[PDB]
Amino acid sequence: SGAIYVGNYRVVNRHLATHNDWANLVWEDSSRDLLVSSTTAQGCDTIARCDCQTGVYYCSSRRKHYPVSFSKPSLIFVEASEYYPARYQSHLMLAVGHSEPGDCGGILRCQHGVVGIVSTGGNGLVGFADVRDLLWLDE
Ligand SMILES: COc1cccc(Cl)c1CC(=O)N1CCC[C@@H](C(N)=O)C1
Ligand SMILES: [Zn+2]
Numbered sequence: 001s002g003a004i005y006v007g008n009y010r011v012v013n014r015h016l017a018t019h020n021d022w023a024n025l026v027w028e029d030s031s032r033d034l035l036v037s038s039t040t041a042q043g044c045d046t047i048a049r050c051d052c053q054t055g056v057y058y059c060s061s062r063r064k065h066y067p068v069s070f071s072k073p074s075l076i077f078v079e080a081s082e083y084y085p086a087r088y089q090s091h092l093m094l095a096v097g098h099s100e101p102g103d104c105g106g107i108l109r110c111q112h113g114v115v116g117i118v119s120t121g122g123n124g125l126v127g128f129a130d131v132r133d134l135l136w137l138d139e
Contacts, residue, residue: 001060002105004114005043006137009036013104013119013129015083031090033119033129036137046113047137055110057118057126061100068108070095073130078120091130092120099126 004011012021014028014035021037028035053072056065070093080086093108099121106118108128120127131137 001102002058002107002117004045004047004107004117004131005039006045006047006114007043007139008039009043009137010039011036011117011131011134011137013117015081016104029090030084031087032092033084033089034131036134047134048110048112048115048132049135050110050112050132052110052112052115055108055115057095057097057108057128058106059098059118059126060103060106062098066097068095068097068126070108070128073133076120076127078127089120089127089129091133093128093130094120095126095128096124097121097126098124 014033017035024037026036073091075088076092078089103118108115116128116130119129
């Protein structure tokens, strides 16, 4: 679990969005596993606007943060799960690092701010849904 709170927006994994997220929907994209809902309170976070490929993510299944080197956002094949059929997930960044299904939502940060959230993983890999291209999160 986990979310980004920026301005009057909440960014979550689309597969973990609540009934309340859907009732306050701003934007969603199944191909990216992202959903953005509106909030009444002003949010706690800064979005990175950069091309970093190193950063630190929170891993809830270890209660720890780990440093990672990750690929640029790209179209990556993701096997079928209970939430989606087998498909290419777009704007995904992969790194070597521990993850389990419930780690989805953990934030990845660089020195500039929030880069994305855990969205996929397996066998010593962890995949992050990028949010740096969503310029409107800051408007
Ligand atoms: C961090 O996630 C994992 C880590 C290790 C192993 C596994 Cl099977 C997962 C779970 C996983 O990859 N899912 C969860 C559901 C939505 C999926 C998607 N984004 O298409 C991705
Ligand atoms: Zn950066």
